[PDB]
Every structure is written in C-alpha cells, then in structure tokens.
Sequence to fold (1700 residues):
Amino acid sequence: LVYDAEFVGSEREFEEERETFLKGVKAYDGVLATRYLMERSSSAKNDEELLELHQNFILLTGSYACSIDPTEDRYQNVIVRGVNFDERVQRLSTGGSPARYAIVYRRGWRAIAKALDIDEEDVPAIEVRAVKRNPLQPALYRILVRYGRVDLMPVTVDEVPPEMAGEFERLIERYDVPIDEKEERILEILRENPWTPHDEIARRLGLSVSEVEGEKDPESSGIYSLWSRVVVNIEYDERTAKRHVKRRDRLLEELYEHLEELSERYLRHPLTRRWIVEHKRDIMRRYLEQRIVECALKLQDRYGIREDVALCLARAFDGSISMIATTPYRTLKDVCPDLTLEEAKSVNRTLATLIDEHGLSPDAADELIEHFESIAGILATDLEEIERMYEEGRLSEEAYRAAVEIQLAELTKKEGVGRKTAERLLRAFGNPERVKQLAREFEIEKLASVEGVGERVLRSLVPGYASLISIRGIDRERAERLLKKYGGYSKVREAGVEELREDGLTDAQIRELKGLKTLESIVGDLEKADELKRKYGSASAVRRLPVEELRELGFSDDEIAEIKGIPKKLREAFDLETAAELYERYGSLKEIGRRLSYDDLLELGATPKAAAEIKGPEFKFLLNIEGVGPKLAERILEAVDYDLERLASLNPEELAEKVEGLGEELAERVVYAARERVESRRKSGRQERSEEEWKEWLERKVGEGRARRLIEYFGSAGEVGKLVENAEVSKLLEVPGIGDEAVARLVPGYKTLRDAGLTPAEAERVLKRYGSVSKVQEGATPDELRELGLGDAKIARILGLRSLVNARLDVDTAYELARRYGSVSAVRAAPVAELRELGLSDRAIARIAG
Amino acid sequence: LVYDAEFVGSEREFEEERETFLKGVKAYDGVLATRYLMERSSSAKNDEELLELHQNFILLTGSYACSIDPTEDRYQNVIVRGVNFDERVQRLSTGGSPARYAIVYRRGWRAIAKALDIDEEDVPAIEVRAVKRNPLQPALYRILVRYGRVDLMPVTVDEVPPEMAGEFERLIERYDVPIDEKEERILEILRENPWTPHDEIARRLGLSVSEVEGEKDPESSGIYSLWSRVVVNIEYDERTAKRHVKRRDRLLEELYEHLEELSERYLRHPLTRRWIVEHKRDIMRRYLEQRIVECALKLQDRYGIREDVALCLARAFDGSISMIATTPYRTLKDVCPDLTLEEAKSVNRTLATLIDEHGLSPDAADELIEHFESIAGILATDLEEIERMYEEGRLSEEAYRAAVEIQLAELTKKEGVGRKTAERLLRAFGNPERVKQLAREFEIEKLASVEGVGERVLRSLVPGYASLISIRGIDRERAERLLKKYGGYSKVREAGVEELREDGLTDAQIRELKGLKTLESIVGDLEKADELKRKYGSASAVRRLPVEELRELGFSDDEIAEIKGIPKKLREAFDLETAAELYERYGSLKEIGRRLSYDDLLELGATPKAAAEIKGPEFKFLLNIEGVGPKLAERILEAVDYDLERLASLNPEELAEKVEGLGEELAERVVYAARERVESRRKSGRQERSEEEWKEWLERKVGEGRARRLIEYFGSAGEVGKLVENAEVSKLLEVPGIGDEAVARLVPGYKTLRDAGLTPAEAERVLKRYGSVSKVQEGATPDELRELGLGDAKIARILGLRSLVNARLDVDTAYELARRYGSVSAVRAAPVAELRELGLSDRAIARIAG
DNA sequence: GCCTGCACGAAGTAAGCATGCTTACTTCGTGCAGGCAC
DNA sequence: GCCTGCACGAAGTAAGCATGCTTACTTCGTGCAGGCACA
Ligand SMILES: [K+]
Ligand SMILES: [K+]
Ligand SMILES: [K+]
Ligand SMILES: [K+]
Ligand SMILES: [K+]
Fold:
C-alpha cells in the first residue's frame, strides 16, 4: 500500500544514516552482482571463490543493516505496505528500532530511503532475507539485523562460528532459553538442515508460515521468538562492534576488487557501478511498485507535483500518466485529497485547457473529461452525438458550448475556413478528425461538395492540392486522380516522365511539375533533364560540374560554354579548359584583365588583339593614342588602379612621378585624354529624373494610388525620389497607406534587411552607411555593425555567417574564417590541421565539418 | 502599354489563323536561330550558306505575315501600344486588315496572339522589319506584308527578282505612279543603296523618320505611301499566291533541316525548339513586357482570374503579385473595374480572410489593408497603435475588432494561452510577432514576467523548454542559459558530454537529456555511449551490428552475447558466431531445438548434453525414461510435433503405428509419462480470478472510480471480467465514463487496432475472430479482413504491409510477397529476376528496392 | 514480488518521419554601363 | 539601337530545417519455468 517514514534526528545523524544506507546499498549491489555472475557462466558457477565473495557481501549487508538507527529514535511513523510499524514495535515487550523492524521485511527499505531523501532512480535496495546461500542461520541473521547486533554479525566468511550456522543449537543451550512444543517441533526439523525454507517447515509441521515464524519478540511463539529470546540475553560486545565498523568499509572495497577480478576472468570485462545500477533497474522494472516510483518521479520532475501527492496518484492509478491525464478532478481528489487544483491541471492537460483557456468550472470540465477522455476525444466525437447529449440533458450548457467551440476552432484555424463553413463541415463529416482524414485521403470532390469549401479551403486542407492545381491544364479531377494514384505530391514529383505522360500530362505540365525548365534549356528532352536532376540535384550544381565531367555524359564544348556562362571574348580567345578555369577563379572578364597581365594572357594563347579585348576598355582606349606601349599602359593602369576617374583626377606632374617609364610630355596627353573621357561621362546618364519621370517611376513601382499618396503627402515626385535615393525608410513608412512592401519596392535591399530581422530604422542606418546589401556583405565588419547598433545574430544573418554561427562559433571568429578562406564552403572544406593551428577545438571542428 | 485584339471569325477561320501565325512564329524563330549562329561562331559567320538560310527564313516570314487575315474581317478592336489600329485603318483610304497593319509594327504580334489564345510563355514573336540582310527592299517588303501580297512575296532566295531588290526602280517605272518631291529625294538616296536605314535617310534629308516613312496608304507622303501607291496598282496573281501557299510549308521544314545540319557542324549540337524559345525569352526580357505577361499567366494559373483582368492588374501594378496582394479592393476596382470581388479575394488573401473568415465589409477590409498592408502587417502592428487609431476615430469598430481578434488568435492558438494571457502579452510586448521573436530568443524570464504566462505557456511558446525543465535539478535559469548558449534544444542535445559537465550538469541529467539510458546499460560510461549514439543512432542498431564489428570498437564476447540476448544454453554450447547466427535466424531456443536435429547440433559443436539442453524440455523428459535413444525421441517429437499435450492425447497402439521404430511395451510407458506430465499441469495455473481478485484487477487497470462504476453498471467484477475476456468493446464503451483509453487498458490490442484506424466495432470483431493483433499479423488474410468489413488501407496497416503498399503495390500482391519471402526486408533483398518471373514491372521492382 | 532469464505481445515510449513555416541552396528577372551600329 | 557583360536581390521556386507527431522504428510489460532459490 503506502511506504513512508519520517526522520526526526539531527543533521549529523541524518548524514550518518545516509552514509550507512548507501554503504548497505553498495553491499547489496555486490550481492546481486555475485548472483548474476553465478547465473551467467557455469564456469564461474563451479567456483567456490564466487560463492565466498557472495557470502561476504551478504555478511557486510547484514552488518550495515545492523548499523541502521543505533539510537532507536531517529525515525518515526514508519509505514510498510500500509502497516504502521511504529505502533507495532511500541506494542512489543523489547521495543527496538522501527526502522530496523521495517528493514527486516522485504521492500521495507522503501520507507527508510524516503526518510533519507535518497535518489530512488538509483534503486537503493537493501534486503537481508537470504536463505539458501546464507552463511548464517536465516532466522538468526534476520533477528541480528533487527536488533542491530553489529558485534555478533561477522564481516568475513571465515569468522562465521558454527554455533551461528550448522551447530546453531550450541548457542541456544548456552543461555538457558525456555522452549514450547511448537518451537521444539521447529528445532527437530532445523537439526536436519538449518537452511530449510520456512515454507517447507510450515508444510511438514502442518502449520502456517506466520505460525512457524511468530512475532519477533521473546514473548511469543515461533523461531523468531526463540532467536529473539536467545539474543536478548546476550551482552553487547562493544569492542567487536568497533572492530567490525572499522574493518567493514575497506573489506567492502576489497570485495568489489575481487568481484572485478572474477568478472575480468570469466567474462573478460568488468561490471561497472552504472551497469550494476541499470541491471538492478531492469530487474526491478517488472514490478508495479517500481512503476509507481517511476511515475511519482516523473510527476515530480516534469509536472512539479509534491512527493507525497505524486506517490498517492501513482499508487491509485498503477503508475499510468496516460490514465491520470484522462481522470477527472473529482476522482483525483477522491483518491488523493491533498492534491491541489493546479497540480491536477498540470498533470491533466485537458482539464487545464478546459479550465483556463475556456473558462470552464472544474465540474463542467470533468463532464467533458468523463464523456470524451481528452481534447482529442472531443475532436474525434461527432457533433451530432454531442448535440444529442446536450438535448437529453446529459451535458451542461457550458460544456456543450466549449466542445462546439473547440471542434469549430480546430477547423477555423485554417485559412479560408469560416465559422459557417466549419459548422457545415462538422454536419457533413461528423468531426474535424474525420475532416482531416478525408483531406489526407485526397477526397477533394467530397470536401468541395460542402458549401463554403472553396479553392482556398482545399489548398489549406489537402496537402499538395495547391501545388498541383496551380499548373495550367490541371483541373481538380486530374489533381485528385494524381494524388490518389501516387500517394502525395512528393510521389507525384518522384514519378517518371513516361508514366506521367501515360497519365495524360503535357510535357509542359511535367516540366512545370518537376521544375526542370532550365535543365530542359540546357538539354533537349525532358528525360535526360530529369536524369540530371536526379543525379546532381540542381542546374546550379550541373553548371558547377567540372569541364571533363561535363564533356562526359554527352555535352559539346559549345554546350559547356553556354552552361558555365563563358563570355565570347573568353571563349573565342583560349580553349575551354583554361577559359572555364579563369572564369571560375576570377568571376568577371574585367577582373581577368585587371589581375592577369598582357604578357600572361599572350602566354595563355590569346591574340594580341584578343588579349587587349580581355584587358579593360581603359586599356583599349589607352592603346588608341600614340606612344603608349602595352607594358607602359599596364603600369599606368596599376598606378591608377585601373580607374579613369583616378587617372583624370591627377596632375600630369604627379602622373609622371608614380609611373616608372613615362615622361611629362606623354603624361600631359594621358591626363588630357582621361579628362576628355570623364567629360564624355556626364554626356551619358547624368540626368536626374524630372518631376513627370519620377511620377511615372513611382506609378510603376508602388502603383498609381500609392504614388499619388506619396506625391500628396510630400512636396512632389521629385521629393519622393530624393527620399528614395537617400533611403528615408522611416519617412516613407510614416505615410498612411505606405507599408514595408511598398518601401521594399522603392528601396532595394530593404526587403532582405527586414527578412534578416532588422528594424526599419536599423535597415535605414545600414543602407545610409554602406549603399546596398551587396556592399554590406562585401565590406561591413562585425565591429562596424555593432557600432551601428545591431545584434550579433542580425550581423551574422546579414553577412552570411548563419551556418558558421549555428556551428557554435561567435560572429568575430566566423568572420575571420570567412575572410581568410573566402567562402563558407571553403571554410567547411578547410584543412583540419590548419583549423587546429588557428586554435579551434576538436568538437568545434567536428561541428564545422558536420 | 496595352495590347489587345478580339477574334470574331468562325472556328475554321480561327484554326486557319492559328496555323498561319504558328508557322510565322516558326519562321521568325528560324531567323533568330540563324542570327545566333552568325554571331556565335566566326567560322559559321564566314559562310554564305548560313546567310542564304537566314534570307530564306526572312522571305518565309514575310509570306506567312502576308497570309494573315485574308478576308479582312476576322479581327476587331485591335489595340497596339494604346493606339487603336482599328480606327487608324478605318481612317485610311484603302482600308485593309487591322491585324496585318498592326503586325508590321514592333511587338504588335502581342495583340494578334491574344486573339488566337497562343501560349505567351512560348513568346510567339513575329517581326518583319529586317533591313540589313533583307534580300528584298525593306519598305517594299513591309508594304507587301501590310497589303497581304503573298503572291509578290518570294519563298526562295533564287526566285528573288532584281526588280524587287537592287534594281527596285524598275518596278516603279513599270507602273509610273505620280511621285512628289519628298519621295523623289528619298529615291535619289535609295539609288545609292536600297538598304539605307530610315534613320540615315532622315538624317541626310534633314527630316524626321515619320516624315520619311509616312502613312502606309497611297494618299500620303513618304516611302511607305509611294510603295503603297505602287502596290495597289498591281493586280493579284492568284496562281503564284496558291503555289507559294502550297510550297512554303515543306520549304520551311527543309530550311529547319538545313539549320540543324549547319548547327551540328559549327557547334556539334542542335538547337532545340525549347532552347530557341528560351533564347527568345532572354532576348525579349529587355522589353519588360514579358514581366507583365508572366504575372498575368501566374494569376490565371493559380487564382483562376480571367485573362483580360489579370493583364489589367499586371499592367497597373508592374506585374507584382506581392503588391497586388497588398492593394485594397477599392483601388483594384479603380484600376480594373471588370474585376470581380471573388477574384480580388482570391488574389488578396488578406482581403479574403477579412471578408469571409471575419465577416468584414469590403470597405472595412480595405481600411485594414490600407493601414497595415497584410495580416502579417496586422500581426506586426502594436495593439496600442490599433487602439489609438480606434479611439481617434481613424479606424472603424468592425476593423478594430477584427484586427484585435487576429492578434489574439495568433497567441491563443497555443496551448495554455487564454484570452486574458494573450491580451496581457500584447500589452507587454506590443505585437504577437514580437512575442514570437522573444520566444525564439529564449527570453523565458522576460516572457514569464507577464501575468498568466505559466509553465504551460512557456512550454508551448519556447521550443525545448519543456524538455529541459522536465529534468530534475534543471531550473528555469539553467534551461534559459543552456538554450541561449547552444542555440536550441537540438544543439544542447548535440553538445558533448565534457562541455555539458563543464556547464555543471550532473551525469544523470546528461543521461536523461541525451536519452542514453539503454546505451549506458550496455556500456559503462557516458562518453562511449554518446559516441555509439553518434555513430549508429540507437541501441537497437547497436544490437543489430554484426559479430565482427561488435568485437571491434572494444566489446567482449560476453558483452556481445548480453547485447544480442543470447541465452545461456546457446552461449555456452557453441561459439559466438554460430550462436548469434542461429539466434538471429530462429528467434528462440525452443525453435532451435524444434527445427535443428540432435545430430546437427552435435555437428555444430555442441556437447551431447548441451545439445539435449538446446533440445526441448520435452526431449529432455523423453530421454529421462529408459530405452529411448536420441533419434527415437526425435522421431516421437516430430510425430507429436513437439507437444506433450498431443503426445498424451493418444493411445499407445496409435503411438506405435505413427513412428517407424518403436514397440508397444515402450509406447505404453511413453503415453503413461505424458499423461502423468499433463496431470502435473492442472495444479500449476488454472484459477479463473475470483470476485475480489477481479475487483482488484479492475482497480489496478482502470482505476478505483471507473472500476466501481463498471461493477455497479454490470452485475459484478466477475461479469466485467467476462466482458473483458470476450472482448466486448462496445458493451464496455456504452458505459458513461468508460472510453477508448480504458478499453485499451482492459483489452490488449485495442489501442493498436484503433491507431490503425479501426472503429471500435471493427476492432471488436477482429479480436473476437482472431484473439490478438499478434495472431492477426501471423494469420489473418486480406480476403478474410475484407469479409470482416475492413478497408484495404486498414488491412495493410494492421498486417504490416504499409511500406509495400506505399511502394505503389496493392494489398493482395504485397501480402503474397510477404508470404513468399517472409519479411519486408527479405522482399527488398529478393532477386530482381525472381520478381520479374513473378510478373512485377521494372518500375515496380525499382520502387520496391527504393 | 523466491528470482530473473526466456519468450511473447503490445503501446506503454522514444527514435524516425511527415509537415508546415522559413530561408536562401537556387531560380530568375531587372537595371545599367560600354561597345559596335542597323 | 541592339548586344553582351556584370551586379543586384527578391521569392518567382524549391529546398532547409525546426517542430510536431506518428507507430513499431524502439522499448516496455507480463507469464512461466527452472535455477539465481523463498511469505
Ligand atoms: K580556340
Ligand atoms: K503606414
Ligand atoms: K526541475
Ligand atoms: K564453447
Ligand atoms: K462512453
């Protein structure tokens, strides 16, 4: 029934009892491990060393049990299986310790362990009821454990005297103890074998086990009474008790060492303490008592229920949290009156939801609990049944309204489903769970037969119906047939082109379904495009494939050049290999011309004119005038960093100083030509849009209405365009009718910055500081962005360090790695030894790689 | 900006115009492909064959353009770029076809293609304004296209007469025609070069391009007027027209063949039709109009909006669906009055939700749309801001209530969050999007600072907080610290044991967090258990690992035997390899003894006594009596199918007959021993529970309350137990307060049958028919279950054919495969040739394998 | 609750998977500056 | 006036991944028989 015990001793006594109980638990764990070694291998079974180790563990367990509660007052209200052992020990002549009188019973340690706050998940089991392999007489052993005779309890199998085992009758006759006829009949059988089970004794004597044992008191009849009568007349040997207490601990550790030695011999592996605890738990798990302890521990940890109330609930409901969650509050209070309503709500989520989220009374909620078990039960129950229960007076108004609102909300939470449509769906198909099942079964026509179920309702209910119906030519019947045939939009997409054609789908429909419109731009037919998508994934990766692999499979060189986006001036100049290599390494033809030299381009196989075309238009215009020379033009462009602006923004005297092989007479002409070019630059696109042009641009971007709204709010379309150019996001948003979508339509990058989690003011500041999100990515530093008032997460997301930061790296180190290695993929493929040299942890590098 | 034209002709005329326009599109695609081949490779550029092919394509394009609208009435309301070409051609003296007069202008084909319902995604471009490489005179070519002179338009470059090209003035002098001084000044320049651009003509003559060209009518001034005056006076050559119509199509296919021949030479790959369409799209993307067309087609395909209204919306909003979805119905009707409210709701999901799901008026919804763009805007807007707008009279009551209900629902959809708590959260943190962001940032204390936010609210909002706080010793501060440090419960779980210990977590806490309770039962410490979970996933897979791999990594043989659950009589008999093999193949030691023979067990390395122990206890008891012999005992057990019951249920005369080698004297004693054994069976277990025992069993199973309710409803606990034993699921469920959970608590297998989707009556019938779900799986047939009223899906789910049915196989064939090959894994590893012999398709076997 | 391994059966439970919101891997369409000219 | 080349960045698309939820995938509960062995 109930196991409980209260500790009334001091803190020192509490710690002493804790240590004693833990040592006894270790001893009994040694007992159990020795029994497991006995049963595991017959080779170890045929070994007296294992048996002597087992018996030594039993003796140490008995000693530590005798050492429990020496003052016989540290514990009170000791209850085992419902029996109050306090009063029972009070009604005895010799009295004694109720804690020890409980520990001599099986599972009685559950009462003492609760009084000492021992972690029940370690299973602190202490049992002293060994009979077969007990080196002592079983009843004498139990009586010594009860009376706490540490002096008489041996700690070594060799210290066991025969007067306590085989020749036990020697000890009785030594103290002149009166014996009745029943105890004489017990002794006449015990003389044959002192380890005879009490069941066999009661069978042969024609009595009950209770009659054979008797009360554990000298003033009774039975073997327990006889051994108590013998023990009480024995004086306490304080010296021997002190010696056993001093010796038993090191002896226990020595027994553990011997156990590990025997395990490493017969099994070639040791039995760890955690393995012993887990095996003890696996053994005890078969018992409803341990299931109750586990349920109470879960109620304490997860739901925060008090220990006593959690134990009461676990006892009353066989340790079934699922059953407690379907039990009404009135029954919970009947079984455990100390339970609080808040604890009942925490354990019963249905009750909690009904009370708090719906304002129901406890009884009104218990109504729904009794009638439908859970919220899932309410969602599965038919609305007609609920209405009938309400009409018949069997369901209260509050509970009925709550159930109807729940069933309706479960459907109205979807887009396009109103209250009327949800009620019609409930009338048509019983319950929202049935509606969900019909949607899973793709019963699209059956769902659309109900009034209110439109295209939006179908898209929100049936998964994949939106993706199918959004294709031209595919109607509702065709989408339903495809879904029911293949088993989901995923399977329809995984289907083959030939079978999709067998279903009657157009090649355009199959292309739109499989998303291979670009792959069919690269490759002629749909079959090979689908094969490429299956093999490599995306057309982007297909383009990223190397030149040799692309020439394999069956692509021409011109096809590969079109795939990799090789320009004409780079395709017709070199071969495909070197052209694609240069393109993949530098990105742009202008970057090629800036990095690689004219002589290098010539050495790679370029025409002296094609090499100049690969060189910048600045180089081309330089070579146009007289007295240039390719190397001198290269030197000039490296001095002005390939920039006609910086070339013209210089005096010819300064120009002749920077360059190594050039005179003033030529520098004058060079600066003149550069200034002529920059004069031809204002004659290009220097015009800033006029009023009508800004008006038309606004009407294009945000529409006629919002454009007129902006023009009326501010001065004119010119002022609106000025605000747009200066990225006045806040001043644009303050206009009624102008929102984030319109601002992002006007201000480029605002949408990306908002998706990154930035406030409009933060996006405005970042744009005013850097220009665009591209320049932010290829420039902004984490310290700069922190000085702009941004958080580290926003900084990582806007710079692209999202994956590296998710790999448990700070923004600073992620930015350093990305800056050293170039790309995030390059950091992920970076050398592990190089990362270790940088100073990253092993687990950090493992997370980076995975 | 607007392109439109309406077709009023009959079905035959519609098909004729469709074919003519498609052939003209093919001809212009050939033109563009020839130009692409000219510019792609200089080797192909230096080839007159490609130029001749290009000119033939141009001539065929001109012919097909002349062949459009022969009756001059098939089209009406022709509008191109805003100009009404119907009225423009009506105001001319010669009249003509407005469709043909529009196609001579750039992009005018967009008007004609809409009248023929041609898929605009193919870009049906037709342009007849070639100047440089035009084999004919450009203005004469355009005028022939204008007046539809298919007879005068040549179909072959060799058929081109010089009087239509170099010596074009010969054709003018053939018809005299009066000419004015401006056209004479144009002719004096055209004599120098007939292909002089109109820009150059207007530049040299000091006039405008419009003044040089003139109206395409004889009653005007310009080169167009002159050529029209010349052409009108030319009689129609019906014979040449009919011959050209008969000849041009096959000529076009021949030109396509020549184009593919030239492409396979200079590029080693052909130009597919889809590639040509994509290149046309890439060219036309610079004309921005295609952006509008794509938006209109998307509005047609997804939301089912009419073509004209979709085009109007895309024009008015620059083809931005995100912008149209944020535009109110009033503005949508102002820009496109033909739009319907249902189409506006379909395109604006916010408007649809406000109108239908919330019962708002169109104006009340346009209010919220103007003020907050979208439902996301409302969720991002502060409740204080909405209340202020309502108080100041700037927001209507209906719109205010709708916005408040939306903001509240977005939070109350979570468990534990009531209306009061949602309102308090809105007051505290502005908006539900801010609440969601705070929950993502693990601001657990900041959220709990609000009244009403309890443990359930925290568990429902913060993901993983429940999993963390449900562990003993872990408090709110520790859970918040762990979440904010690692970045989610997933990362906390992926964290290492050493760093979790560095955070101060107990080993028990780390075990409960990582779910390594079984792996730490197999292996001693936590580090190796976590490594095993990382490498293999689950202890189940660790057990499934082979013997060699298990001996690797560092497991002992006894450890492997404990892992694989090898019995003692099978572990001590053979070696680990053969023991684990036999166990994985047969399951139980009794199955080993029944299948394998005594001689086989001996051949595998078993002791003559260990082989008998591996054999059944029936075999052991048989060998107990005298004069048996192991082979004779095997024969007896094979005769009685290893069943002492069937052995005792026989006469010794019948016993001596079945086995081939046994006498009557021995059969008598065998039957005697078997009957003695079955007599020793009735004293073991047979007691049908008494009344008090049934009462206690009910109190254990369904609880005290429901047990007493059942005992009162029915006769007694005995009757309740009878109902349970006979699986009276319906008769138990009819009791108020008894539900599926209690029934499954009483009736084993009911929970599994219900999770399989079976109604309680179906589960009751299946249980009454078969006994248990185990026997259903190991016995029930699909035909039997269909006769029991079950569906094929339920049959598959209850028999375990779920994966095979998901592999697009019917239940009958899936059951046949599972019966023949045993297991689903065996069907997967089955021979592909054997499956083909069975008669499965290639794709079917592929789906089985994958 | 002798005691737990051996075996089976079933959902208890927790690993593996479907699902829906989120987020750029990938599309994919736009803007614009030079460069030869139709 | 096209054409090519590159930069830009939003979501059109389509995978990424968190977060919930199935079910037998993985664990847990029960009966029994003979050995660890007792009400
Ligand atoms: K080359
Ligand atoms: K606004
Ligand atoms: K806790
Ligand atoms: K062996
Ligand atoms: K009921």
Remarks:
- The two ends of chain A are 52 Å apart (CA to CA).
- DSSP finds 63 helices and three strands in chain A.
